[PDB]
Amino acid sequence: MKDPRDVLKRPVITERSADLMTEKKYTFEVDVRANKTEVKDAVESIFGVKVDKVNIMNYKGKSKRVGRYTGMTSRRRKAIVKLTADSKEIEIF
Amino acid sequence: MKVTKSEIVISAVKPEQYPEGGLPEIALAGRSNVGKSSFINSLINRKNLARTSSKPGKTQTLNFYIINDELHFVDVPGYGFAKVSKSEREAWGRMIETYITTREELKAVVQIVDLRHAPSNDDVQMYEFLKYYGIPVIVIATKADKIPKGKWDKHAKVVRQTLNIDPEDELILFSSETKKGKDEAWGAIKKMINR
Amino acid sequence: MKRTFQPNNRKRSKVHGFRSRMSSKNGRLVLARRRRKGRKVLSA
RNA sequence: GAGCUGUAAGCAAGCUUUGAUCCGGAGAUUUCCGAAUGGGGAAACCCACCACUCGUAAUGGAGUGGUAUCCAUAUCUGAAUUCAUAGGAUAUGAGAAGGCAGACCCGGGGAACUGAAACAUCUAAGUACCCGGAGGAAGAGAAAGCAAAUGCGAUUCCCUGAGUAGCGGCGAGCGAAACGGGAUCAGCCCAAACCAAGAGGCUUGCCUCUUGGGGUUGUAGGACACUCUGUACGGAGUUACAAA
RNA sequence: GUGGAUCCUGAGUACGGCGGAACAAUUCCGUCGGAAUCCGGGAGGACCAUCUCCCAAGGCUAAAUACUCCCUAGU
RNA sequence: UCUACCCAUGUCCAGGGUGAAGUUCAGGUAACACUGAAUGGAGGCCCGAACCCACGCACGUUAGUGCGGGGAUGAGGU
RNA sequence: AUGAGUAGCGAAAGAGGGGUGAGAAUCCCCUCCACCGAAUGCCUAAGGUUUCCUGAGGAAGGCUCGUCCGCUCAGGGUUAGUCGGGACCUAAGCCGAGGCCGAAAGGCGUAGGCGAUGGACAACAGGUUGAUAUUCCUGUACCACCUCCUCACCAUUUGAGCAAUGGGGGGACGCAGGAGGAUAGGGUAAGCGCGGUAUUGGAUAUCCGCGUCCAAGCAGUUAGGCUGGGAAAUAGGCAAAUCCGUUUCCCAUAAGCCUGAGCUGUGAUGGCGAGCGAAAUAUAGUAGCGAAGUUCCUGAUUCCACACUGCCAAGAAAAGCCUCUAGCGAGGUGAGAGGUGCCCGUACCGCAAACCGACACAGGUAGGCGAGGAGAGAAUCCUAAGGUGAUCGAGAGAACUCUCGUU
RNA sequence: UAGGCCCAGGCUCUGGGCACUGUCUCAACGAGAG
Predict the structure, then answer these.
(1) Is the dihedral of CA A38, A40, A43, A44 positive or negative?
(2) Class (C level, CATH) for A3-91
(3) Which terminus of chain A has a smaller tally of CB atoms within 10 A, N or C?
(4) Closest CA–CA distance from residue C43 to any residue of chain A (Å)
């Protein structure tokens, strides 16, 4: 990473994500080459909060089809950041 | 001493198939899992020319190896338990004894024993057999790397006592795993060929 | 976005794999021939 | 010079006559693998060291460069041998490493079937194939030649000689050259012997080491000795004719 | 240009043996040898003489020719 | 990556029976022999599940599937 | 096209009521019945690669059907310092600098590197969602490393400490057989909460269901092996060594030593737990509440432990470890307290309709657990927990073929 | 679920005797699948 805004891509808005958000946990899509400490520091810098823990998944691509052609979607990296008893990242969802 | 050519001539189970040429020959003898098929490999600086294994009964014929085209090495099956049918275990003994009794080209026989333990009954009942037909014997105590260095002279004394080795024949402590006592064995073989 | 066959068989890759093909002049000849024909997949 | 946001839909949101979309020249960026070259490896991935920078009270984390082998040039040291030398280390190297155009050409190795109604050589065939080297072309090149003349005068390619001479179980078959007609058209440089300078062994001399003049030739030339002639206002050239 | 008193014109080479290779034989390569050098040599199937042409053992040279994975214009 | 043979490292084999060598005890033998006990727990040992069998024998049909037979601590299977 | 509406459509148990729906034998629910149960159960590999969950769907596909599906389409879903692999080690094997035999293509091979199917190495019990659970949440731990810190105890090249790439030890291993000690597990008596039956008769020694609990660390304990223990000399083990030898004495018959399954209190005023049980929630039904929670008998195919005895064929290696000095050494050790801990896998199937093979199946598929009665038994028969009714039917009951029964 | 016995010789082979039976004289009925 060079600028922390290149580590976080976009937030994840689902039912599971909205459920976890009430436990003070936030879910982001992360650059596939970023590691836990990188995400921790990026969230520290961008939002000015205190981070307690970070967990990361790796997701394979899915097979899709539009008519006769077949392909795969991109791989994804997902991070669940647990903030401490501090402020609240306003995702303005 | 500086082997540069080595190959297997023929594996035989009958006197007919014995090679010809009049070259001197050296034979091997010992228990089934003592390292004699690897003694050859360690002497001629080859890895698995005479195939070895940790399962008793890997060598099942008479294998002849030409060493730099002046002599032959004879690889024989070992005695004792052999992980093969009982009927085929005595055929090897008969095959070996016939070759030893015949074959004028046989210069001397190298008998290999395990240094870790005192030699078995079969080792003595082979030393007696070789001393009774008047064939010069070189006695080799292999697997000396499994023993601490400070007990070689203690274990060799027991080896000598059990086999009642005549003062003349020497006992060379060998190790196919660290190449110890290789030059002494070569020297003894060279002496036994010419003399 | 590809198709994979036996992505766990290590012997398959150590026999017909790319790095084994590139380890001898004959394997490099094989790769050159398959590139000349226009194959989508070179080696395993 | 008026529309545009590819295929290619749709569906949104926008740009443009203060000139877009589009076309051409020159640049910038160029993740990872791959000769792949920091080490490893099941190609698209793991794990490092050094210097600097970001960050922490510090450990942990991140970014940017460098780190293969061989060869050459040196610089030191320098295993054996003291120097030297193998070597080691250090530096400087847009060096070379791989690819391809299934084409063309140089060199090396090199089949068998087939046919000869059989098979004895031969033929197939120096073909297929394999290995090495390249270049835009490539070896080829200016007579110790042809040959028998009123001689031609480097090399290469086309026509003809000729499917002839010749070689051939002289059988299958293989197979020339010179003359003549054309395409293209230039030939040069060094060594050697002599002169001048310095050194290095030798006693000066001598004698080789080098550097500048010298000279490129056969009905011999050069050196050498002596004459004119010059060093320019003339000639030649980066395509060999030194070189630029 | 005049001469031509005196030096040079390409060393284990030119040629010979020794074997295979190749195949009087023929050459290749090795295996041993081994000259001359202007009044000097080499050739014209052999050798022996006449005449006729040339000058070996140093190097560099475009063009005419071969082929096209490609690009352009066409048939 | 099938198949033949081989190498390194793991792993599996319900139960039941038989009873070797040796040892002790005695008798007994000069003493060994032997005798009898007791102990002992050996074996390509016996019966037999899991497991294995180019072992027959069908079958239906290109290797299969079933039905007998065999081995089942070993020349054992994986 | 013909054969021809022919042969097939395989085991093996279903029946009815209700629902949905255009349509029901085949889908969902209920009820009874039936089958497996050393599995047709639980978990977890190899292998597969989204097949997993929710909603929609009726082209195609599923030996019949289909409102259903492992099928189609949209959204979702996989969280680790402690699990497994890499910033650890080596086997077989592979690559193999230098090197050797070569005229050469080549062949042989050492140092070194790579390489698990083995060795090292720190976390447990509950709860939770439609889909993840020794990863999330709660509560209690552990491991390695780092100091803005706080204490304690030492030492100043007289020396406290750190200690090797060297020495020694250790990791470190087989089979068979028979004792012993425990525990998982399985069944009686107390106790708890339900019940009192309508078909003759039971307040009855009646019937039903339940009857517990981690790692960690503070204890003590079976048992086991012992190296007999100490002193000197010793230096041997390339240097050195207080370490290991090796000698010489002395005491030794039990001192000492090193390893131990399990049990007791703590973890826990915590959890779980028969059964009660809402609002109505989106009327699934949960949310929520919660009793007793012991003794006795029997007992391993698991642990002590390859501990003991017998045998030969002696059943890997290396690192991590422990020591000894050589050596480094002015600042250090031990406690707290505060911190740091990366990458890859994680859904789902795993005796299967997700794998393999497929005449297309009724086949194959490392391993761990594998209950009761009758039993030598994991055989056999019926059952427990749990799973399933297998994927064309209806009905007739001729010849004939196959598998059975009787004579 | 789970071996037929006895008397012999020859080392497993040939025997012999008994038991027992749809192997048949000679077939009949019943169950299931087609």
Answers:
(1) negative
(2) alpha beta
(3) C
(4) 22
